[PDB]
Amino acid sequence: GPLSDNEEFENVVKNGH
Amino acid sequence: KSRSLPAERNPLYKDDTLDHTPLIPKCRAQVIEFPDGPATFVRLKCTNPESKVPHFLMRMAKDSSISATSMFRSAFPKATQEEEDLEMRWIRDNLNPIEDKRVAGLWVPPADALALAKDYSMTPFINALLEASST
């Protein structure tokens, strides 16, 4: 559920998008 | 100063005076592994009610540094890149961003973020993000 947004959060943190 | 904020703001932030407490349960903690090791973040998902589009407010667990550019993009969905660069430049010259090789964007200490939250009408959301538990 909340795992759906794990990847995009981590990519925003590390690369800004 | 060298500043002019975008004109259209996320309707989510119409009222800066609301109590933040009901928002705290909606934060999530997430661990991200970096070359030098793992670090924990607290994130709050903010869906603009009219474009249905979600952004993350994000906070570092260890020192509560908050991504100012994530705040900006959630507050001003129709901002140009020149508007963003203008304001991030402003944050540099008037606040005290942190420097961190591992994370993209401009991050600032808690008190700076709450100063921005007043400007962006996001005070309930930053308060909830800062008061949320990392565990």
Author numbering:
A (entry chain B): 85 to 101
B (entry chain A): 6 to 140
Describing publication, verbatim:
Notably, Rap1BBM and Lem2BBM share a common sequence feature: three to four consecutive acidic residues followed by x-F-x-x-x-Φ (Φ stands for hydrophobic residues). Among these proteins, Sad1 has been shown to interact with Bqt1, and mediates the attachment of telomeres to the NE during meiosis. A 14-residue fragment of Sad1 (residues 88–101), referred to as Sad1BBM, can bind Bqt4NTD with the dissociate constant of 3.7 μM, as shown by ITC assays. We further determined the crystal structure of Bqt4NTD-Sad1BBM complex, and found that Bqt4NTD–Sad1BBM structure is virtually same as Bqt4NTD–Rap1BBM and Bqt4NTD–Lem2BBM structures. Sad1BBM interacts with Bqt4NTD in the same manner as that in Bqt4NTD–Rap1BBM and Bqt4NTD–Lem2BBM complexes. Mutations of the critical Bqt4 residues, including F46, F61, and R48, did not affect Sad1 stability, but severely impeded the interaction with Sad1BBM. Sad1 is localized to spindle pole body (SPB) and plays important roles in meiotic telomere bouquet formation. For example, S88 of Sad1, at the N-terminus of Sad1BBM, had been reported to be phosphorylated in three phosphoproteomics analyses.
